[PDB]
Amino acid sequence: PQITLWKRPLVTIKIGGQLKEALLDTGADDTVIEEMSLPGRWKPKMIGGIGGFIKVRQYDQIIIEIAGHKAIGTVLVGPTPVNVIGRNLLTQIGATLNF
Amino acid sequence: PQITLWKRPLVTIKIGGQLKEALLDTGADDTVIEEMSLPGRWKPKMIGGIGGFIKVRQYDQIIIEIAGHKAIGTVLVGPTPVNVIGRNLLTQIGATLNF
């Protein structure tokens, strides 16, 4: 699709068998999802932005479907106020900024 | 241009006659820049990010160039970790997200 930016660019994702809403965030290096179970091993990470830092769990090789487009990559899980799809998965669905 | 997301989407901006670097950020409602002097009166605003909330100074109808495109609009100034160009100005330069 072509997504205009008059409103927040929210899409449906499927992760871990669950449907969620998430924000497409070109300003995020990483993908960060609210608390949920994911398979495999994890390691802790601290990630920051406006307001400071939160602690998350890093899971690798997670398959996600983003507005219908499958991608695989690292997903961070923790107390984020908003589910965010960051660049590590936006690249995989071929997302670009155009002007 | 067409900007891919393998690296951070950093562009040069011009504000107050000065060149700065900023992040094109579809996940930001607003444009937030690090401490600098801007003309006129400001109004208070609270904004949120991944770590919580911060207070910023809201300046309206500020002239700002983004990657060579002229915009005039609201700029927030405060303790953001990075300069961010949000949707308020991304819409003025005609930016879309495409996949």
Ligand SMILES: *O[C@H](C)[C@H](NC(C)=O)C(=O)N[C@H](C(=O)N[C@@H](CCCC)CN[C@@H](CCCC)C(=O)N[C@@H](CCC(N)=O)C(=O)N[C@@H](CCCNC(N)=[NH2+])C(N)=O)[C@@H](C)CC
């Ligand atoms: O981790 C890397 C190194 C990097 N961190 C830093 C410190 O650079 C990073 O990628 N951080 C990510 C991040 O927070 N990126 C932000 C830009 C760069 C840091 C400032 C942009 N993220 C968005 C979405 C965050 C959602 C939790 C963001 O902060 N949006 C704000 C911007 C402020 C503004 N007023 O526009 C935002 O839109 N805030 C509005 C509220 C939105 C509330 N939405 C809901 N649903 N409640 C607002 N009006 O205040 C993070 C994500 C780590 C990878």
Ligand SMILES: [Cl-]
């Ligand atoms: Cl990844």
Ligand SMILES: [Cl-]
């Ligand atoms: Cl590409």
Ligand SMILES: [Cl-]
């Ligand atoms: Cl504006």
Ligand code: NA
């Ligand atoms: Na894994």
